[PDB]
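Q: Beta-amylase, please. Structure only.
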Amino acid sequence: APIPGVMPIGNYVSLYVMLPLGVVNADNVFPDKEKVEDELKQVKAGGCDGVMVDVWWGIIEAKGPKQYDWSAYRELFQLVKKCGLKIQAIMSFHQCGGNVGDAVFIPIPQWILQIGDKNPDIFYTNRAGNRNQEYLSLGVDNQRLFQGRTALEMYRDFMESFRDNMADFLKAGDIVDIEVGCGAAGELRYPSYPETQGWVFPGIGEFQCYDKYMVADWKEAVKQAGNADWEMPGKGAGTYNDTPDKTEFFRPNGTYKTDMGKFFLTWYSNKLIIHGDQVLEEANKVFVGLRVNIAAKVSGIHWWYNHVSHAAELTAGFYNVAGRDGYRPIARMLARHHATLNFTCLEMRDSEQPAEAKSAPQELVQQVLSSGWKEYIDVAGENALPRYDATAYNQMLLLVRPNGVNLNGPPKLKMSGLTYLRLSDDLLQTDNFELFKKFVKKMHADLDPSPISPAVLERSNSAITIDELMEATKGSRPFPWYDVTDMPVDGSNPFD
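A: Structure for Beta-amylase:
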């Protein structure tokens, strides 16, 4: 039996905090150095392991192709290191802000956007012909349109430059995680619920495959299946703020369940998996042999999860329905690259969502974490929305150790890390910050903050075919979850 009071260190879950947006600004300057230094000191003194920051493509490569300026990011990283903190860096090949609310606006490089004025099909496009300018469509990953480069080559060259220009932070163990941005907002998904085209929760979203590149690919695919005339979804799919039962495509027994529907949903979800595969392959080639994790971010699309159609999942590109696990194939792709899955919604409870949304964040998290663990990858995560209350912190503590602490060794089920959204004035307010420090102590299994490295990143494994990957869609039971955390922020123990 274990010795009373001894907590095995394998129970510890690292806790990182996301830096404010614009910490390095759109002119590639790091302003308010003193304020930031101060915040970093408070975060460290609260026990946090590190911080996460976006490394914005539209800052670094702004002046032109392969003109990279890493100066301000080096100053920031040096400061974080000096405050005793680890760094998670996001390779952010997407747009920051741009709405009236948003305090910062950083588009992708203007020399890319200029290409888009004359070729709007470089962007994800909805069936009405709206272009999302926040990210380059997967349809252009391998199109040599960008002053002699393809999109994948641009991503590769940027990551190589980052590695070479941060070589000393990488050697010293200061940079611990590279999150590779794979879509708008950095997430591996289609931009199916854009605020800029009027989406409001809990709309079903819209398919984002109408650019001419993805269309040429589709037309070829359906011809080979023996159905030349199958079209992409039309008016039957409805629009962003429909509910599934108001559509033909997503109603019970609707189009999604027809042979044409299944064929379309397979193709659509496979193009997203292939895009992830190609982007992470480039990351693995850059970072192989270094002690750093490489991660992809999958957003938690929890609305309509309890509807037969899983319509919001489907429009986002995750073909997850009864009898078809749409996340496990992503995890298996990730495993090939020795990459980590970063998921969201770790704080959410089903009872917090309106009933009409058919929303099940708890069961979604359980499915996705279970499917990643079954593929022998690490899974990390984030809170989806800002939360400062004990209920939220206790839900995240449940998710990071879904069968609580293990006094005999490392837990059976443990997330590899949590990144908290986000450092702000509200978080540092005296009351909230007090609660937050208890959350961090519980993340650490009541151990003291404890600095060593990620594993050495192995080279990507040999390729498997699309069809071998589809074996991973077989449905399975998720691991059983506890109903409450072991280590609530009030210090009690619900098992005594």
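A: Brief note, in case it's useful. The CA atoms of residues 402 and 481 lie 5 Å apart.
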